[PDB]
Structure formats: structure tokens, C-alpha cells
Amino acid sequence: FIKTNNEWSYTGSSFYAPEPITSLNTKYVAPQVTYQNISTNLPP
Amino acid sequence: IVSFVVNAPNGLYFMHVGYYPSNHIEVVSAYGLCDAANPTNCIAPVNGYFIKTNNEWSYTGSSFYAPEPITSLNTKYVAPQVTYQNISTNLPP
Amino acid sequence: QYVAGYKVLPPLMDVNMEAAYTSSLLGSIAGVGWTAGLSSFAAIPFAQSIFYRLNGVGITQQVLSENQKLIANKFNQALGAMQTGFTTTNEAFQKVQD
Ligand SMILES: *[C@@H]1O[C@H](CO)[C@@H](O[C@@H]2O[C@H](CO)[C@@H](O)[C@H](O)[C@H]2NC(C)=O)[C@H](O)[C@H]1NC(C)=O
Ligand SMILES: *[C@@H]1O[C@H](CO)[C@@H](O[C@@H]2O[C@H](CO)[C@@H](O)[C@H](O)[C@H]2NC(C)=O)[C@H](O)[C@H]1NC(C)=O
Incomplete structure (x- = not known):
């Protein structure tokens, strides 16, 4: 990332x-505290 | 595939059951x-x-x-390649 | 060998047997390693073989799909570097001599 x-x-x-990131190179994982937050440009 | 362990009069004796293929044919993929x-x-x-x-x-x-026939249960989505074979007449689900 | 007298046995198989074994393994090295399990055979052309093998070790498919020629030239010079490399500096050649 x-x-x-x-x-x-x-x-x-x-x-x-x-x-650029897609669904072809990531997995949906339960959140943890150390993960970064974003609400400006949503990834696909 | 599987294995079994038994004793031996001076050591360890091993069974190994494995896959042995035969009657191999040629197909187009x-x-x-x-x-x-x-x-x-x-x-x-x-x-x-x-x-x-x-x-x-x-x-x-x-x-x-x-x-x-193919389903989502045995495939995964991979990025396009030029060498991949195209299809346009009967799309699987 | 006879001045003192002792036999030197030839190896268990003739040189053509080793040639056949190495030729078979070189013809199958492109095809065995594509799927786990050795029942199937996947004798791919070597280009797509090395593309998938280099993709599986942490390389995105885009850069290999756009830069076949440079990595091919790198492969060619890498293989050609060892042609003149047979000297004292080679560890394996020294072990052969030893
Ligand atoms: C992103 O925001 C979430 C929501 O607050 C943060 O997640 C929580 O952060 C608090 C603060 O320490 C923790 O007590 C919770 O346990 C967290 N919950 C989860 C589910 O992670 C998160 O830390 C933020 N990420 C940042 C700022 O990088
Ligand atoms: C399947 O169709 C696609 C798109 O029409 C082909 O991909 C392009 O093929 C042309 C000519 O071979 C290349 O110049 C392009 O670079 C290709 N695009 C990409 C993104 O690689 C593809 O070759 C076709 N495959 C088959 C087997 O017909």
C-alpha cells in the first residue's frame, strides 16, 4: 500500500x-487500531 | 497421501500410501x-x-x-493478460 | 593400474543414460512446476513459465507484461556470464577438482 x-x-x-489499487490485490480483513483512516478518496 | 509408523527390531519401519497415476491422456487447455x-x-x-x-x-x-463446468468455487479473478484465450459466445456465470 | 594391479570399475550406466536423464529433466523442468501435485503435466513454453515463476515471488504482472525484452536480455547476459567463469574463482569447479 x-x-x-x-x-x-x-x-x-x-x-x-x-x-492503482483494485479488488484484485487485496483482501477484506477485520479492523485493527493501527490501520490508517481515510474518508476523502474512497478506493474502488 | 498418508503414512504409518511401526517399530522394528532395531529401528523404525514406515508405510507410505501415495497417489499413483496411470492411463494418462492428452487434452487441449x-x-x-x-x-x-x-x-x-x-x-x-x-x-x-x-x-x-x-x-x-x-x-x-x-x-x-x-x-x-466452471463456477466461482474453483476460480479466482486475475488481471487481464494478452495471452489469455478470449471468449464471446457462451459466457459462464 | 596393472603395475601394482587393481581394477577400476566403470560406472553403473553409460554416458548416454545420463544424457537421457538430463535431457528429460530439462524438458520437464518447464512443465512440472505449475501446479502442486505431480500427476498432471504442464509443458508450457518457457517464456510463460518464467513469467509466472517471476510473478509468484512478488512481482506485479504489469511490469513483466511491459518489459519482456529487458528482462530477457538480462537473462541472456546472466547465463552467458558463466561461460568464461570457469576458473579458480568458481567454488564448484574447485570442489570438482578436489
Ligand atoms: C481510525 O478510527 C477508528 C475509530 O475511532 C480507530 O479505532 C479505534 O480507536 C480507539 C482509540 O484508541 C481504540 O480504543 C479502539 O479499539 C479502535 N477500534 C478499532 C476497531 O480499531 C482507529 O484507531 C483509527 N485509526 C487511525 C487513527 O489510524
Ligand atoms: C483478446 O482480446 C484482447 C482485446 O481485444 C487482446 O488484447 C490486445 O491484443 C492486441 C493484439 O494482440 C495487443 O496489441 C494489445 O496490447 C492487447 N491488449 C492488452 C491489454 O494486452 C488479446 O490479444 C485477445 N486474445 C486472444 C487470445 O485473442
């Missing part, structure tokens, strides 16, 4: 290449 | 089925292969030839 200077995006684990 | 109208919506088989067969595609496993 990279931050961008180009507002998050996706990057893998072995190459630096930001790209 | 693809790498990913994706709609032509919607290029984003592409799926890929899970622990198996998308199969073209005769009495259109179906699903097969990975250790036995058991043809079966």
Missing part, C-alpha cells in the same frame, strides 16, 4: 512500481 | 478465460485447468480427468 508523489497506490514486494 | 466485451473481467482456474472437451469450456482438476 504505497504512498504516491505523482492518495495511495499498489506496489508488489520485489520491484518498485506504483499502480 | 487454455490459460485464462476472459470476456471480449469486458476485457477487465478475466478469471483463472484454481488447482486445476480450464479445459476444452467434448461430450465452450469446463474445469478439470490436477490429478484426475473429471470434467465439470
Whole structure:
């Protein structure tokens, strides 16, 4: 869950290449306290 | 698959029951089925292969030839690739 | 070998048997590793094989889908680097000599 200077995006684990997040690269997990909050630009 | 352990007069003696395939045949499969109208919506088989067969595609496993139509229960959504085989005439659900 | 007198047995199989084993394993290395379980066979062309193998270790599909040529050239020079590498600096060559 990279931050961008180009507002998050996706990057893998072995190459630096930001790209927009989708449902194809994440999973729905129960919330924890340390997770960041956002209410400005909702991810798809 | 499974194993069993028994004693031996100076050691340990092992049974191992495993899968042994036979009567292997050759078929024609693809790498990913994706709609032509919607290029984003592409799926890929899970622990198996998308199969073209005769009495259109179906699903097969990975250790036995058991043809079966694909569902969401044995596939996952994967990003489009140019090498994935397209389909436009009979879309699975 | 006979001045003192001792036999040197040839190995258990002729060189063509090792050639057949290595050729079979090189022809199957592209195809065995695509799905867990060794019952099926998946003799893919080697390009899609290395694409999926490099994708599975934490690389997004986009960069490999757009940069086949550079990684192919890197693979070619990486394989060609060891052709002249057979010298004292190779640990495995030193172990062979030992
Ligand atoms: C995002 O907001 C939620 C809602 O307040 C925060 O979650 C709770 O934070 C309090 C404050 O310490 C905890 O006592 C609760 O246990 C948290 N609940 C859950 C379900 O996490 C969350 O910490 C905030 N995230 C930030 C600020 O990064
Ligand atoms: C399935 O259709 C898609 C879209 O029409 C094809 O994807 C494009 O194919 C052209 C020509 O091969 C390429 O120039 C584009 O770069 C492809 N797009 C992407 C996003 O990769 C795809 O080739 C078709 N597949 C089959 C098997 O017919």
C-alpha cells in the first residue's frame, strides 16, 4: 500500500512500481487500531 | 497421501500410501478465460485447468480427468493478460 | 593400474543414460512446476513459465507484461556470464577438482 508523489497506490514486494489499487490485490480483513483512516478518496 | 509408523527390531519401519497415476491422456487447455466485451473481467482456474472437451469450456482438476463446468468455487479473478484465450459466445456465470 | 594391479570399475550406466536423464529433466523442468501435485503435466513454453515463476515471488504482472525484452536480455547476459567463469574463482569447479 504505497504512498504516491505523482492518495495511495499498489506496489508488489520485489520491484518498485506504483499502480492503482483494485479488488484484485487485496483482501477484506477485520479492523485493527493501527490501520490508517481515510474518508476523502474512497478506493474502488 | 498418508503414512504409518511401526517399530522394528532395531529401528523404525514406515508405510507410505501415495497417489499413483496411470492411463494418462492428452487434452487441449487454455490459460485464462476472459470476456471480449469486458476485457477487465478475466478469471483463472484454481488447482486445476480450464479445459476444452467434448461430450465452450469446463474445469478439470490436477490429478484426475473429471470434467465439470466452471463456477466461482474453483476460480479466482486475475488481471487481464494478452495471452489469455478470449471468449464471446457462451459466457459462464 | 596393472603395475601394482587393481581394477577400476566403470560406472553403473553409460554416458548416454545420463544424457537421457538430463535431457528429460530439462524438458520437464518447464512443465512440472505449475501446479502442486505431480500427476498432471504442464509443458508450457518457457517464456510463460518464467513469467509466472517471476510473478509468484512478488512481482506485479504489469511490469513483466511491459518489459519482456529487458528482462530477457538480462537473462541472456546472466547465463552467458558463466561461460568464461570457469576458473579458480568458481567454488564448484574447485570442489570438482578436489
Ligand atoms: C481510525 O478510527 C477508528 C475509530 O475511532 C480507530 O479505532 C479505534 O480507536 C480507539 C482509540 O484508541 C481504540 O480504543 C479502539 O479499539 C479502535 N477500534 C478499532 C476497531 O480499531 C482507529 O484507531 C483509527 N485509526 C487511525 C487513527 O489510524
Ligand atoms: C483478446 O482480446 C484482447 C482485446 O481485444 C487482446 O488484447 C490486445 O491484443 C492486441 C493484439 O494482440 C495487443 O496489441 C494489445 O496490447 C492487447 N491488449 C492488452 C491489454 O494486452 C488479446 O490479444 C485477445 N486474445 C486472444 C487470445 O485473442
